[PDB]
Structures are given as C-alpha cells and as structure tokens.
C-alpha cells in the first residue's frame, strides 16, 4: 500500500504557506517530512492528517482518493494520527484507553478484543499501569499508551507529529525503537519534527520542505549531501 500526496497548497490570509508539496509514502516505511520551521512542513503534515483543509491538493491511498474525505474517514481508510501533545484520555485508564478504540473495531469481537488489548498492553510494557488513569503516568509511559491506543485502531499509515519533542536523549533511543516497531508491523510512519538530526537516523526516505515547496527527496544520506538543504536548512556544518 502507498500513500501518494501531490501538489499540496494552502494559504493563510492570502499568504501561501504551502506551494506544491508532493511526496509519496508506502506501508512499512518511516518517511520524514522535514524542513525549516514555518516553511510548510507542519502545514503539509496537517493537511495530510486532515486537520487543515487543502486549498489545492490530491491525496491517494492505493488508488483511493482521500482529498475530499474528512479526518475520521481518512482514519477509517487506514491512517493513524499521534498528536505531539498529551492526547491520552485523562479520566480513562490505560487499559480503558486502548479498549475504547478497540471497541470501535467492526472486525473484532469481545472475546478477541480482550486478547488484542492484552497483547497490546504486553507489547509496550504498559501492563503494570493498565488500571492507572491516563493523567497519573509518566511521559514515556503515557506516550507508549497513546501509541498502543493508536495501533488498536489498526492503521496502515501512522502519522507522527513531533515524536522527539521534549524528550531526553536517553529516551530518544526508546522512541526510535518504538517507531521502528511501527514499521515492523507494516504501519508506514510519516514523521515531522524540529529535531532533524535524530529524525534522520530512522527515516528511510526524507522530504525537505522550504518556503512551501519540497526541495529534497531521498535517503537521509542524500539529504545530508544536498547543496540546498544545507544552504537553507541544515547549515554548512551539520553532524
């Protein structure tokens, strides 16, 4: 499965924040939507998610158009969204957090819904907090619970917003391990983040968006050897 996005466009008060952003992502790929801050990478990611309606654009998922579809319809088509901020249900426990999205699965019955919830809890090592509320867990545990809840919806493409945001370098490895699991389960993962250096360490195919247009495409090595990305975004020296 592939998520083909072409010719994105959006203006804010007659100011085109995004101008012709086109990129392709396949299932089982960690594609990074990077670029200078405010250059349209965040807006492009949001229109891909469905939180910002496109002015001009075409979004496809295996020759199935999603441009006219709303965010929930796109999610039903197999697209997941992980907000950067705390998106956990405050008054629901972690097990209840996962089960609330699991109960919406039309192809799962309760007998196997319980098994899916148990294996999701065991996968992310959040079983010890299955009975604890979403507001009474640490940041890493809360993020793991959110990712398990998102996986409970069975998405084909998980769109991560700033996964490495406000996280210690010690837990950057844990987040990288998690986002490499999301690609071991087939879930294409689209990452937009300000922390580009550790984002490029997991991405298989990176996209750089400058002043609303995509200026680069390829593996992180190709981005790092580019003569324009290091001219507008990465700087002359970048390790």
């Amino acid at each position: 499965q592939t998520l083909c996005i072409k010719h994105l466009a959006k203006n804010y008060s007659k100011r085109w924040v995004v101008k012709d952003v086109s990129f392709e992502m396949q299932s089982g790929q960690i594609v990074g939507l990077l670029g200078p801050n405010g250059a349209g990478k965040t807006t492009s990611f949001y229109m891909v998610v469905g939180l910002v309606r496109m002015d001009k654009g075409e979004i496809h998922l295996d020759n199935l158009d999603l441009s006219d579809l709303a965010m929930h319809e796109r999610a039903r088509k197999g697209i997941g969204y992980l907000p950067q901020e705390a998106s956990i249900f405050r008054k629901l426990t972690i097990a209840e957090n996962i089960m609330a999205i699991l109960e919406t699965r039309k192809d799962l019955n309760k007998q196997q819904r319980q098994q899916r919830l148990q294996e999701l809890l065991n996968d992310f090592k959040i079983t010890h907090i299955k009975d604890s509320l979403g507001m009474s867990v640490s940041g890493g545990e809360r993020r793991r619970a959110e990712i398990a809840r998102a996986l409970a919806a069975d998405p084909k493409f998980m769109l991560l917003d700033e996964p490495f945001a406000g996280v210690d370098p010690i837990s950057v490895g844990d987040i990288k391990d998690i986002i490499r699991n999301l690609k071991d389960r087939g879930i294409g993962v689209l990452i937009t983040d300000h922390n580009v250096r550790e984002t490029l360490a997991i991405c298989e195919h990176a996209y750089i968006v400058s002043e609303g247009a995509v200026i680069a495409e390829g593996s992180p090595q190709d981005i790092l050897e580019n003569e324009q990305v290091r001219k507008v975004y990465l700087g002359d020296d970048f390790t």
Binding site: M71, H72, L82, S87, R90, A100, E103, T104, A150, A153
Partner: protein
C-alpha cells in the same frame, strides 16, 4: 467505553453548569425579591417559598441551556486536550460522538418534558396563589421608616422600624381619623402610648388595637381545546419545548470545533447567544400564537430551522 466516558463527562459538567446557572439566575431574581421585601411590598419570610415554587420554571430554561453549555465544555475539552484528534484519528467523528450521546439527550428530554408538562404548571399555580395572597397586603405591612406610605384611604408614617416589619416607632396614621403613637407592633396592630384625633375629637390611650392563568393550568385540562389560541400556544410550548434538549445536542455538536490555543470556553459566548436566540424566537412565537397570529405549526418549524442549521454546520 467511549460512550459511557462521554456520558459521565457531560453529565458531570452539565450538573455543575446547571447548579451554577440556577445559583446565578435564581439568586439574581431572589435579590430583586429581597429588594421588594425590603421595600415592604413582600414578606421576607415567604420569598423562599417563591424560590421553591419558581424552581421548575427556572429549571425549564436552565436544563436546555445547562445541557448545551456542558456539551460545549466537554467537546471543547476534547478538542483542547487533543482527545478529539485521536478520536477522529481512530475513525470516530464528532457527529459520531453526538449520536453516542443521543440516549443522554433523550433522558434530558424526558426530564424537561416532566418539568414543562407537570412540574412547571404546578409551580406556576402555587406561585400565583402565593402572589395573590401577597398582593393583598396593605396598611402597616407596606410602611417604611422615615417615609409616608399611602395605601387607599390610609397615610402612614413611621420614624423607625426593626429588622423585621414589626415594632414601629414614631407612628403617624391618617384616614378623617388621626392616630399618633410612640410605639406600635403589628391588619391587627397594637399601638403603645398613642393619641387618637378625629377631624374635633381627642382620645388618649396607653394601648390600642387597630383593625384597618394559562401558564399555570394543568396539562390534563389543556390537552384538548386546541382551537383556543391561548390554550394552543401553551400546549404547543409544553409539547415542543422539551425538544430544545435535542436541538441543543445537535447545536453543541455543530458549534464546538475549537483549537487548543483558543481554549475550552472560547466558543461558549457566541454559541450561548445562538441558543438564547433560539429560545427568544420560541418565546416570541409563543406570544404570537397567544395573540392568534401564528398557529401551533411554528413550534416544529422553529425547532426544525435551528436543527437543520446545526446539522448543515456540523456537516460542512
């Protein structure tokens, strides 16, 4: 789990908002009642009975408004806390949440139907009887200190008055019979150290004894008689009134899309104004039907216009 989660949040916040709105509005009316009592035109010991009897009438408006504000607060919290992003990101639309809270809307509709059909008319008739009992007070009941009170053929002046409307001091009474007493206690009034004059007769004494609606009708009695425009208006109001709960549900689902930065309370005031506009339109239609100018058909039309507007806004 998501349905019971949303129902718990909406019930809790709607109960909080209903209690807060009851306090605000009913105390704002109770303060006017207390001012009337302080002016002597109402008994200070019965204003709480008025509060009790007008509780159904105020709740008749607070319940839809409270439900609407609670729904707005819950959905704004979902949007702000990014819980709506993961709900939408899981295939659960906002309209899906509105449909999930349909049973709670029906419960609140049943509650408001109980209020409008039975509780509100009963409270209104009790309050009307109480007001008729309190509209007959006259004489020393209406006296104020250091002022002259004229009630029919009686002109009354009192130089002082206690915290309660008893134990008058420096009393001047006019009819023509003139009575001036140093003290008087309350119409049966016991005067102390007074002098009686007639206009010429004089009589001194140490003590003296002086001895100077369709909105409330039962729904059973108004179910028939649709031909009468007033009865028709009242019954249409009592029947189509409870559906403002459902209108509030589909309207707060429509007008709750708020960004995290704006906040949970950002869109409350415009949406509260829209709901109040709906209720004012309903009241105007009620008056128009009572004047035999619009007909009962306007109630479902008024509800359906706002419902269609809310549905179109929520599905844009």
């Amino acid at each position: 789990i998501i349905r019971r989660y949303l129902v718990k949040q909406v019930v809790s916040t709607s109960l909080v908002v209903i209690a807060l709105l009851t306090l605000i509005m009913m105390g704002g009316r109770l303060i006017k009642y207390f001012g009337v009592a302080a002016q002597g035109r109402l008994d200070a010991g019965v204003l709480f009975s008025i509060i009790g009897y007008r509780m159904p009438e105020f709740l008749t408006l607070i319940l839809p408004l409270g439900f609407f504000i609670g729904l707005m607060l819950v959905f704004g919290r979902l949007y702000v806390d990014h819980e709506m992003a993961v709900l939408n990101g899981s295939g659960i639309s906002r309209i899906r949440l509105g449909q999930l809270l349909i049973p709670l809307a029906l419960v609140f509709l049943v509650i408001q139907g109980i209020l409008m059909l039975w509780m509100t008319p009963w409270g209104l008739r009790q309050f009307d009887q109480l007001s008729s009992s309190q509209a007959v007070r006259t004489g020393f009941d209406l006296v104020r200190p250091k002022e002259f009170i004229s009630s029919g053929p009686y002109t009354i002046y009192a130089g002082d008055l206690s915290e309660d409307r008893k134990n008058l001091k420096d009393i001047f009474f006019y009819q023509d019979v003139m009575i001036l007493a140093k003290e008087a206690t309350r119409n049966v009034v016991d005067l102390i150290q007074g002098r009686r004059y007639e206009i010429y007769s004089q009589a001194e004494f140490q003590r003296y004894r002086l001895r100077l609606k369709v909105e409330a009708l039962p729904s059973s009695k108004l179910w028939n008689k649709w031909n009468d425009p007033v009865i028709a208006s009242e019954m249409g109001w009592r029947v189509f009134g409870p559906f403002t709960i459902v209108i509030a549900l589909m309207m707060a689902v429509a007008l709750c899309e708020v960004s995290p930065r704006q906040g949970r309370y950002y869109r409350l005031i415009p949406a509260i104004f829209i709901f109040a506009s709906l209720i004012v339109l309903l009241i105007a239609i009620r008056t128009r039907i009572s004047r035999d100018e619009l007909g009962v058909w306007a109630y479902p039309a008024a509800l359906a216009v706002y419902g269609i507007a809310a549905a179109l806004f929520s599905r844009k």
